[PDB]
């Protein structure tokens, strides 16, 4: 009712590639989203306020009479009482816990917030955790490293206008993550024909042969990359490079070595 729904966006143990991915949205562009559609009430990467003023901005949002939706970017470092990841003098885990409590809904943008991400890879020095594990609540997961802005903004709009979209067993919206990368790969006929590139310099590579022998995890990865592409132009396999499985939980340890199927 003229009011724009309030969104609070927290950055935890992250590389900001998810923030970057979100601003690549074109349906709508980010300016339109935050001017017309939502009220982005806290976002460290782009917000004007700093320090105490930024902290008051957050607290204002969390106390908003209309409530807010929470977007979480990054995993949660839990070692030493959460002190290896701090904002404004407070452990990230403490602040996310507090924001989550009264959130209308929680969207984890990226594999880091969904599942723990890169900092959780062995030997996990910071004892990093995904949000759901850390807080003990169900989250809407938009994984990928980073996810397609199509998937995130798609989810965001769905949540605000329609409700919680149907989620797969790992909390991923089926609209976007319901299909294997491999099932929509243009190189699928080569895979079917057992026509694999043995190396990146091979004539087979030059001819666009399947990349499975080079470690492609397309066959075990749920994402929509070949269908929707990135940046309206490309995706990794189109660029001659195997899928890393970057939308699968704990892929840093389950999908490695990246150049093998072993």
């Amino acid at each position: 009712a003229k009011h724009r729904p309030s969104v609070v966006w927290l950055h935890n143990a992250e590389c900001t590639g998810c923030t970057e991915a979100a601003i690549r949205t074109i349906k709508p562009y980010i300016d339109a989203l935050i001017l017309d559609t939502i009220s982005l009430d806290y976002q460290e990467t782009i917000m004007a306020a700093a320090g105490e003023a930024a902290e008051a901005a957050l607290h204002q949002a969390l106390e908003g009479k209309d409530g807010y939706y929470l977007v979480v970017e990054g995993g949660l470092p839990t070692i030493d009482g959460g002190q290896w990841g701090m904002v404004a003098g407070h452990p990230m885990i403490e602040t996310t816990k507090k924001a989550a409590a009264k959130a209308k809904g929680i969207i984890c943008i990226g594999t880091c917030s969904a599942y723990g991400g890169v900092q959780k890879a062995k030997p996990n020095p910071s004892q990093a955790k995904g949000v759901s594990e850390a807080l003990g609540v169900k989250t809407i997961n938009i994984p990928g490293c980073p996810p397609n802005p199509i998937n995130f903004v798609g989810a965001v709009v769905h949540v605000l206008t329609k409700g919680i979209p149907d989620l797969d067993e790992n909390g991923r919206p089926k609209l976007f993550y319901g299909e294997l990368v491999h099932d929509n790969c243009p190189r699928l006929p080569h895979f079917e024909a057992s026509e694999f590139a043995p190396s990146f310099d091979s004539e087979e590579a030059k001819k666009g042969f399947c990349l499975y022998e080079l470690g492609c995890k397309g066959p075990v990865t749920y994402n929509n990359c070949p269908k929707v592409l990135f940046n309206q132009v490309n995706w990794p396999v189109q660029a001659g490079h195997p899928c890393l499985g970057c939308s699968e939980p704990d892929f840093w340890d389950t999908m490695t070595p990246f150049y093998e199927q072993g």
């Binding site: 590389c15 970057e20 990467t45 700093a50 020095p125 030059k206 490309n234 189109q238």
Partner: protein
């Protein structure tokens, strides 16, 4: 003028530092309205170097790329260069060209986003834009920038109307509690300039999308490219006609915006804030160089970089030394790492996290303190610009002088936060001037021969270094391979150089030193700190990794 300055004596802490990548806490002691001491305190550790141990050297680039998604690609590039050196492979010409073009696209995206979406709000009072007459603003735009429909009175009125409806809603979103709300003594721009800058801010939100699309044509996607492999690149399609036509078409759009909006906006602002040419200067600059015509080895990179490598000490532009990779080391005395880690060359790098407490003056950052022969080094656009300028690189010489003239300032005025800010635009313009040449070179080459990846063998035992000058400066990845696995992998990252803590001698880092002498108009709203901090374009995820 002169520069607004309060009488404030006491500490100021700014945490979070917003409009950067990552988690930074700045602590300052102010005396009589000027900063007398500073501390750069990085607030997040992830530990990629620890994570990489024992892994397949081929995997490194995928792990290290996640050091940062703001400067996406650069770590993948540095890791691939690093591993290429360790296995002693020389990438094909096409791979060198493609890798360098992607870097170029990264510069364009990165500098455009930083200026507008990270930096401008320190200089530009957006709410003041609502006071501007759009006809007065259109006229002023004609007098400070090239003709473009985006700067018309109608186009500036529409922006103002969009902003007004936004502000009138009561939901300020990302402007909530801005330091410029209600006016601020340290914001000088006329409302007309605020309107112009704000119009471009919104345009740049669209333009960065195109910049990222151009990059993804060669890189597979953005953020987080996926086209580099040991021995070169995978992206044969990135050598063909239509994709390269589209790549050039998108880059020309981006470059038109750099020239029509970014530089003019930068110079306009620079003109109003000329006092900032005497604030936030440092003494030593280091660059590994970038855009080499020969990337067969780190030594060839250093020597053939078209943005040249070099070392300036004590602002002495008459003496640019060669880079000595053996003289790089990192200290941890004032960092959150175990005692005994000081003075390590990155090949002998140690990453042993040890947290103490917040604002502990003896241990106050998750960043290491990189030093060169004992000296803190500023890296990034300003370092590159000075080094290129001192060396008489013709494009840098021309552009620096265009800037020094327009601003009627001596080159020594560039040793400052204003210079640092301006340097970033200077190099953006030069990348832009080089794109079509570079693209044409690769198009012609890939047409003749589409070789993109070289044959190579994994050695049992070895070491290598991958150098790059990322958008924020001199980046190096250092690998030791033992049993065909990662034995040691160390990243030494531009923000580590710039925003790290004190070294083992208690010597301040570049940002810490730059902050000394910062005037504080309003201690409640210390934008001046942000101006200097933001000028280094900090990336804490990069710095700490």
């Amino acid at each position: 003028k002169p520069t607004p300055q309060s009488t404030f004596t006491g500490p100021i802490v700014v945490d979070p530092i917003t409009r950067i990548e990552g988690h930074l806490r700045i602590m300052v002691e102010v005396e009589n309205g000027k900063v007398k001491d500073a501390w750069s305190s990085s607030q997040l550790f992830r530990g990629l170097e620890i994570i990489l141990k024992g892994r397949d050297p081929r995997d490194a680039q995928h792990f290290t790329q996640r050091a940062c998604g703001m400067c996406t690609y650069v770590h993948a590039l540095a890791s691939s260069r690093c591993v290429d050196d360790a296995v002693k492979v020389s990438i094909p010409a096409n791979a060198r060209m493609m890798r360098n073009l992607v870097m170029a696209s990264q510069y364009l995206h990165d500098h455009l986003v930083h200026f507008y979406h990270m930096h401008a709000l320190d200089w530009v009072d957006v709410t003041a834009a609502l006071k501007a007459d759009p006809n007065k603003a259109a006229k002023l735009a004609a007098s400070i920038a090239p003709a473009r429909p985006g700067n018309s009175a109608k186009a500036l009125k529409a922006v103002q109307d969009k902003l007004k409806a936004f502000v009138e809603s009561g939901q300020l979103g990302i402007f909530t509690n801005a330091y410029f709300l209600g006016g601020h003594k340290a914001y000088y721009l006329p409302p007309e300039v605020d309107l112009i800058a704000t119009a471009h801010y919104l345009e740049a939100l669209h333009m960065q999308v195109k910049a990222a699309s151009a990059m993804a044509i060669l890189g597979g996607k953005n953020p987080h490219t996926q086209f580099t492999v040991v021995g070169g690149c995978s992206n044969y399609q990135g050598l063909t006609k239509d994709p390269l036509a589209n790549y050039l078409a998108l880059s020309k759009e981006v470059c038109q915006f750099v020239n029509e909006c970014y530089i003019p906006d930068l110079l306009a602002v620079a003109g109003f804030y000329k006092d900032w040419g005497g604030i936030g200067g440092t003494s030593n600059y280091l660059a590994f160089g970038e855009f080499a015509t020969d990337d067969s080895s780190p030594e060839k990179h250093l020597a053939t970089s078209q943005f040249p490598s070099g070392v300036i000490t004590g602002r002495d532009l008459g003496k640019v030394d060669n880079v000595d990779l053996g003289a790089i080391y990192e200290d941890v005395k004032y960092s959150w790492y175990a005692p005994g880690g000081d003075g390590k060359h990155p090949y002998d790098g140690v990453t042993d996290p040890k947290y103490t407490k917040l604002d502990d003056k003896d241990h106050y950052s998750w960043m290491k303190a990189p030093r060169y022969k004992g000296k803190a080094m500023e890296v990034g656009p300003l370092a590159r610009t000075f080094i290129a300028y001192a060396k008489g690189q013709p494009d840098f010489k021309k552009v620096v002088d265009m800037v020094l003239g327009k601003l009627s300032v001596p080159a020594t005025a560039l040793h400052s936060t204003l210079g640092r800010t301006a340097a970033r635009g200077i190099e953006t313009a030069i990348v832009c001037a080089n794109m079509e040449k570079w693209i044409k070179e690769m198009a012609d080459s890939g047409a003749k021969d589409n070789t993109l990846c070289a044959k190579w063998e994994m050695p049992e035992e070895s070491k290598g270094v991958g150098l790059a000058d990322a958008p924020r400066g001199a980046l190096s990845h250092w690998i030791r391979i033992k049993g065909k696995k990662i034995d040691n992998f160390q990243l030494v990252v531009p923000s580590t150089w710039n925003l790290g803590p004190r070294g083992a001698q208690g010597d301040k880092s570049p940002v810490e030193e730059a902050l000394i002498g910062t005037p504080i108009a309003d201690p409640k709203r210390p934008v001046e700190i942000l101006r200097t901090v933001h000028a280094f374009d900090p990336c804490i995820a990069c710095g700490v990794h």
